[PDB]
């Protein structure tokens, strides 16, 4: 005697996992495929008559630094981080569209604003003593003074 009423909550829980899996597997795959079609919305949305059957690109996982370089390189070639192109020669725009991230190298905010963490003999010297900065400014001053020769 199998009690089917006890199995009803498990069937709903089974559908709960399927709801997440069905939406995530399909919506994410469709979004990647749509953005790989071209650089403009008229190609991503509208499907051409002569275009073949749609080939879908599945989500990428277990990546490394090389995949980060590839994603940026694909962006500069197709307008998408996972764009598709097997052309032998790139466009002229690819030569000068390189992206170089420039950012500050300052210490974390917690290191310089915590009421306790920011206090140490060396941090006080960096913050309040000019002994280090006066000596290092000599190197900067030597650069300009050594130009005329």
């Amino acid at each position: 005697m199998i009690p089917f009423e006890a199995l009803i909550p498990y069937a709903i829980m089974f559908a709960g996992f399927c709801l997440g899996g069905g939406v995530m597997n399909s919506a994410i795959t469709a979004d990647i495929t749509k953005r790989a079609r071209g650089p403009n919305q008229e190609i991503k949305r509208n499907v051409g008559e002569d275009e073949g059957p749609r080939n879908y690109t599945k989500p990428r996982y277990n990546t490394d630094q090389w995949d980060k370089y590839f994603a940026v390189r694909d962006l500069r070639l197709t307008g998408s981080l996972r764009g598709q192109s097997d052309n032998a020669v790139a466009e002229e725009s690819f030569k000068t569209n390189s992206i170089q991230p420039y950012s500050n190298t300052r210490r974390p905010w917690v290191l310089r604003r915590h009421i306790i963490m920011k206090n140490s003999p060396t941090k006080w010297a960096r913050k309040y003593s000019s002994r280090r900065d006066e000596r290092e400014q000599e190197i900067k001053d030597d650069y300009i003074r050594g130009m005329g020769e």
Binding site: D67, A71, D86
Partner: protein, 183 residues
Amino acid sequence: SSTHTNDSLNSSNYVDKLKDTHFVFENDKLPSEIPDVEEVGATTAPLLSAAYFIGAKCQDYNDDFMLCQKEAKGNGPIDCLKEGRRVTRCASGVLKDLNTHCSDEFRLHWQCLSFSNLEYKNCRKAESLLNKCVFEKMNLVKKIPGIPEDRQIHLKQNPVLKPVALHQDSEVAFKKAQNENSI
């Protein structure tokens, strides 16, 4: 490896906000004294599909470019511009040949890689058709150095690790070659 760096795109815009990252463009080309070259236009999937064909065709130019780097004693980027352009043209020629002789087999392979997380183990059926077509039309053979010829993983008959989901286009093309080519 997803470690944040100052050399490429980070994981999220919150990292950019904390770093105050500026994505800087340059509108200047290379100076005219450096001869111009045509950059490779293949994305990640086609490059991984043709990786062993570029190596086979352009092995001497790959080694010469890399030997220039080691013998430049730190001045590699500037001195080895001439050797760099040889590799770019040779690699472009391989991709051009793949689009004129094996376009159907080539496109079947790297579209499988895009379908299967760019893993070689999940596209053996498409790769085998591509490898056969390239050899019969370009006399280029995939080879994995350092191991005996019969112990190459891409030639293994019964691999332990196999793709979870079959690629339908690869399955249909593989059957079309089994019955016809091997009567």
